[PDB]
């Protein structure tokens, strides 16, 4: 509440929300990601990744293609605004980023890059 948000990914490849609002009074924003499932990183990993809506597909494609040993992200990917590490059951990670990286009126998406086979894990992120 206010300048943070706690998000979960499960064994059903779902995030517990598909929408994040960042208040513009915030100097920083923090995402606390957790995994209440039972399965490990290699089979059911989740990360939290931020990019503009235009860049999401590119990030996911090159990320899925980068493999487990890179946490499913293209190394040196400038399109990534912020991200957590890849987590499995019972693990957690948090990322804090400067609200200055976002611009009001601009369209952003948060998403996971783990190749699950099910429908892409994503949601909207808005600066207001
Ligand atoms: Cu995921
Ligand atoms: Cu990175």
UniProtKB/Swiss-Prot annotation:
Keywords of the record: Copper, Disulfide bond, Electron transport, Metal-binding, Periplasm, Signal, Transport
Subcellular location: Periplasm
GO CC list: periplasmic space; plasma membrane
Domain Plastocyanin-like: 1-128
GO molecular function per UniProt: copper ion binding; electron transfer activity; identical protein binding; transition metal ion binding; zinc ion binding
Residues engaged in binding Cu cation: 46, 112, 117, 121
Record-linked InterPro entries: Azurin (IPR014068), BlueCu_1 (IPR000923), BlueCu_1_BS (IPR028871), Cu-binding_ET (IPR050845), Cupredoxin (IPR008972)
A Pfam family this chain is assigned to: Copper-bind
Superkingdom of origin organism: Bacteria
Cystine residue pairs: 3-26
Protein task: Transfers electrons from cytochrome c551 to cytochrome oxidase.
Protein name per the record: Azurin
Organism expressing this protein natively: Pseudomonas aeruginosa (strain ATCC 15692 / DSM 22644 / CIP 104116 / JCM 14847 / LMG 12228 / 1C / PRS 101 / PAO1)
């Amino acid at each position: 509440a206010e300048c943070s948000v706690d998000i979960q990914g499960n064994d059903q490849m779902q995030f517990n929300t598909n929408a994040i609002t960042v208040d513009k009074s915030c100097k920083q924003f923090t995402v606390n990601l957790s995994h209440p499932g039972n399965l490990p990183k290699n089979v059911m990993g989740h990360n939290w990744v931020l990019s503009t809506a235009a860049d999401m597909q590119g990030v996911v494609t090159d990320g899925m293609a980068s493999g487990l040993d890179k946490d499913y992200l293209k190394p040196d990917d400038s399109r990534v605004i912020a991200h957590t590490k890849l987590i499995g059951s019972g693990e957690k990670d948090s990322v804090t980023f400067d609200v200055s990286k976002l611009k009001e009126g601009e369209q952003y998406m948060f998403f996971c890059t783990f190749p699950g086979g099910s429908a892409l894990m994503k949601g909207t992120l808005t600066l207001k």
